[PDB]
Design a protein around this ligand. Structure first.
Ligand SMILES: Cc1cc2nc3c(=O)[nH]c(=O)nc-3n(C[C@H](O)[C@H](O)[C@H](O)COP(=O)(O)OP(=O)(O)OC[C@H]3O[C@@H](n4cnc5c(N)ncnc54)[C@H](O)[C@@H]3O)c2cc1C
Ligand SMILES: Cc1cc2nc3c(=O)[nH]c(=O)nc-3n(C[C@H](O)[C@H](O)[C@H](O)COP(=O)(O)OP(=O)(O)OC[C@H]3O[C@@H](n4cnc5c(N)ncnc54)[C@H](O)[C@@H]3O)c2cc1C
Lengths: 394, 394
C-alpha cells in the first residue's frame, strides 16, 4: 500500500488531522488497534476551547456541535464555605469555552471520514514503524493474520500515551519530564439534569469535587479518590453521598441524582517529551504529552499540535517548503509548557494532598483567596482557562 | 513607674508605634534589651511601600526620607539569558516603591523620639510580662542590677523573632505555621555606585542574586548560599566573582566593585502565629510573623500592624471604644497571609532548590515566562510588589 501521510491512531487527534489533510488534497491512511465501538466507549473530555471549535469548523465537521454544544461564559470555584464566579467572557476579552463531549466530537469526525471515503484500517494489530530517518518510511501491521506494509512520506503518531510511536524513537534522543500525582479522579456519567448551568470546581477538606455536564439532560461528576481505590468499591449510592458531602449545601440540596451510565477512575499525571519529532515521525496529542484533567487542556493541546502539523505539512506539499517541518516541536512546546503550568497550578490549589503541613494548607487557601479576589488574579485564570492564543508562524 | 502603653522593643515597629501614639497624646515607654548603637548596626531592609512612606509622614518623621529616599517606578527580573522590566507604576495604577534603608528610618525615628522627650529605657535586661489577662498588666525589668516595675494598660510586643512577648503567651493558645528554606542570603554592603537605577532580581543556575541600593553612592548585593556557609569563608573577592557569575554579562561588565562595609548571612524563613494577641498584649512586626526577604514585605507588614494597632488604641483612648481591640488579629492576618503568599511565590520562582527533578525545574522556568510575558501576569506581580491596600475598618 502507498499513501502520503500515515496516521497511527483514530482517536480525536488522528481523525482531526486526517480530515484537515483530506480536505486540502493530501492523502492519508489512519491505522487503529481497536474497533470503532471501543474508541467510542471512552467518555473523557467535556470542555473545548474556541481554537478547537474553529478547527472543527475548518475541517467542516461542526453542524452538530453548533446545534448541541453549550457555550459557557463563566465557571465557579467553591472553597471554604464560599462560591466565586469567574466571568470568562468579561475577563478574557470576550472569549468563551464550549461544552460538547469527546465521544460526540469523535463520532462526528468518524461520520465525516466515512462519507468522504478516506482510508481507515481498524483492528490493525502490532503496528511497527520503520526507517524513520530515511526518504521512504514505512509502517507494517497485521490484518486478519497477514502482515502488510504501508509506504508513506511522513508518519503522524496520534496514538495516545500507550502507543507505539513514542516507543519507536531511540530513547537517548528523548528528554522526559513527569510528575505522578498521589490521587485519581472517580468520574460518573448519569442521565440527570446538571446541578448548575456552568461548571463548579470544589476544594473541600474531604477532597476535590467537580460538577460538569454533557447536555441539558446529561451530567458528569468527579470526586478525588486515593490511588488505592477501585471502581467496584464505589456503588452509585456511595458516590452521590460523597459528592454531596463535598459541595456547598445550597448546591447539594438541588442535586438530581440517578444510576450511572458509566463510572471509572483516571490517575492524574503530568508528562512532556522533548523533542516531539524524530526524522519523519511527528508526535501529536497524548502521544507527546499528558496534562491532569483539572485545567481541561489535553484534547485542546492535541487540537493545536494538529493545527500546527496540518499547516506545516500543507507548506511542505503545496509549497515545497519541507524545511519548515523542523520547527514543529519548538512551536508546539511553547504552548504545551504554558498549559502544563496552568494545569499543575489548578491541580495544586483544588486538591487535598497527603504530605500536608499547616503552612502549605494555609498557602493553598490564600492562593484561592488572592487569585479569586483580585481583578488581575481573575484575569490570569480566565485567559488560561479560555486558551492562550495559537502561534501565527512562518 | 506608670504609663499607658508599654512597648517592648526599639526597632522600627516599636519606635513608629511610639511616635504615632506620642503625637496623639497617648503616653508610652519603650523598653529595649540592647544599646542604641547595636540597634543601628543592623542593615536589613531597603524597600518601602507607599503605605509605609505615608505612615512616616503621619508620624512627622519624613524630612530626610523625602530628600534622600529614591522613588522607583520599576524592577527587573533576569532569567535564562533575558531581562524583563515590570513597570510598577503603569501596571499598579500609579503606585511606586521607595528605597531608603532601615538603618536610616530607625535613626530618624530615634532622633524624633529623643527630641520630643518621650521615655526610652535601653539596656533593659530580663524583661518579663505579668498579669496579661488582668486590668492592670505590668512589666518587670532590670536596669544596673535593680529590678524595676512598670505599670501600664496595654503592652505592645515589638521585640522581633527572638523576643520575650511571643514566649509569654500560653503555648496552647497559639497556632504556629512555619516553613524553613534550605538556603540563606549572603548580603554585602559597599560604598560603590549601584549597577542599575532599579533593582535586579536574578534567577541563575548557580543560585539567586539580587542587585539593590541605598543611595547614588552606596550599594547592597545578595547571593543565595547553602545553610552550611559561614561568612568568614566569603572574602570580598569571592563574593564579587560569584555575583558576576550569576548576572547577565552586560550587567556584570558595568559593575563597580569595592571593599565591604558590612557582610552577613540571613537564613530564609516563613513564620505566622495565630492569634497575634493575648489579653492586653498585642504582637506587632517580626514578633508575630517572618517573611523571606524576596518580596520585601517584613518591615512593610510591621508598618501595617502598627498602623492598625495605633488606630485601634486611639479609638480605645479618645473614644472609649476598647472593644474594637479584639478585632486586631483578624484585620492584620488578612494582610499578613497575602504578603506571605507573595513572598513564598517570589522565593519559589527565583531560587535554586536542592530536591529538584526535571519537571519542577521546567515549571519554575515556565512560571517566570508566563507571569512576565502576560499583562494580567505582570499586574499580579506589580500590585503585590507595591503593596496591597490597607484595610479601612470600624
Ligand atoms: C477524565 C478525563 C477528562 C478529560 N477532560 C478533558 C477536558 O474536558 N478537556 C480537554 O481538553 N481534555 C480533557 N481530557 C484529555 C483528552 O481526553 C485527551 O488529551 C485526548 O483523548 C487526546 O486525544 P488523542 O487522540 O491524542 O489520544 P487518544 O484519545 O488516547 O487516542 C489515541 C488512539 O490511538 C490508538 N492506539 C494506541 N496504540 C496504538 C497502536 N499501537 N496502534 C494503533 N493504534 C493505537 C488508541 O486505541 C486510541 O484510539 C480528559 C481526559 C480524561 C482521562
Ligand atoms: C536580609 C534582610 C532583608 C530585608 N529586606 C527587607 C526589605 O527590603 N523590605 C522589608 O519590608 N523588609 C525587609 N526585611 C525585614 C525587616 O528588616 C524586618 O521585618 C524588620 O526589622 C521588623 O522590625 P521589628 O521592629 O518588628 O523587629 P526588629 O527590627 O527585629 O527589632 C526588634 C527589637 O526588639 C529588641 N528585643 C528583642 N528581645 C527583647 C527583649 N526580650 N526585651 C527587650 N527588647 C528586646 C531587639 O533588640 C530589637 O531591637 C529584611 C530583613 C532581612 C534580614
Amino acid at each position: 500500500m502507498k499513501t502520503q501521510v500515515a496516521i497511527i491512531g483514530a482517536g480525536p487527534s488522528g481523525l482531526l488531522l486526517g480530515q484537515l489533510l483530506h480536505k486540502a488534497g493530501i492523502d492519508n491512511v489512519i491505522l487503529e488497534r481497536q474497533t470503532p465501538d471501543y474508541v467510542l466507549g471512552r467518555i473523557r473530555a467535556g470542555v473545548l476551547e474556541q481554537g478547537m471549535v474553529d478547527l472543527l469548523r475548518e475541517a467542516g465537521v461542526d453542524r452538530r456541535m453548533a446545534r448541541d454544544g453549550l457555550v459557557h461564559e463563566g465557571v465557579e470555584i467553591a472553597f471554604a464555605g464560599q462560591r466565586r464566579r469567574i466571568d470568562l467572557k468579561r475577563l478574557s476579552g470576550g472569549k468563551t469555552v464550549t461544552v460538547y463531549g469527546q465521544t460526540e466530537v469523535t463520532r462526528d469526525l468518524m461520520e465525516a471520514r466515512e462519507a468522504c471515503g478516506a482510508t481507515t484500517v481498524y483492528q490493525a494489530a502490532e503496528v511497527r514503524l520503520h526507517d524513520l530517518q530515511g526518504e521512504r518510511p514505512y509502517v507494517t501491521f497485521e490484518r486478519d493474520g497477514e502482515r502488510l506494509r504501508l509506504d508513506c512520506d511522513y508518519i503522524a503518531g496520534c496514538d495516545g500515551f500507550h502507543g507505539i510511536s513514542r516507543q519507536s524513537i531511540p530513547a537517548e534522543r528523548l528528554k522526559v519530564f513527569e510528575r505522578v500525582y498521589p490521587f485519581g479522579w472517580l468520574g460518573l456519567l448519569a442521565d440527570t439534569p446538571p446541578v448548575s448551568h456552568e461548571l463548579i470546581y470544589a476544594n473541600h477538606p474531604r477532597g476535590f469535587a467537580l460538577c460538569s455536564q454533557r447536555s441539558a439532560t446529561r451530567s458528569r461528576y468527579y470526586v478525588q479518590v486515593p490511588l488505592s481505590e477501585k471502581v467496584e468499591d464505589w456503588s452509585d449510592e456511595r458516590f452521590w453521598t460523597e459528592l454531596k458531602a463535598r459541595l456547598p449545601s445550597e448546591v447539594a440540596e438541588k442535586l438530581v441524582t440517578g444510576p450511572s451510565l458509566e463510572k471509572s477512575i483516571a490517575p492524574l499525571r503530568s508528562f512532556v517529551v522533548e523533542p516531539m519529532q524524530h526524522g519523519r515521525l511527528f508526535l501529536a496529542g497524548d502521544a507527546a504529552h499528558i496534562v491532569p484533567p483539572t485545567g481541561a487542556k489535553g484534547l485542546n493541546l492535541a487540537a493545536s499540535d494538529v493545527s500546527t502539523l496540518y499547516r506545516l505539512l500543507l507548506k511542505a506539499y503545496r509549497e515545497g517548503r519541507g524545511e519548515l517541518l523542523e520547527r514543529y516541536s519548538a512551536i508546539c512546546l511553547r504552548r504545551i509548557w504554558k498549559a502544563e503550568r496552568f494545569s499543575w497550578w489548578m491541580t495544586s490549589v483544588l486538591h487535598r494532598f497527603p504530605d500536608t503541613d499547616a503552612f502549605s494548607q494555609r498557602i493553598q487557601q490564600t492562593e484561592l483567596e488572592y487569585y479569586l479576589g483580585s481583578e488581575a488574579g481573575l484575569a490570569t485564570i480566565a485567559e488560561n482557562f479560555v486558551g492562550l492564543p495559537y502561534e501565527e508562524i512562518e
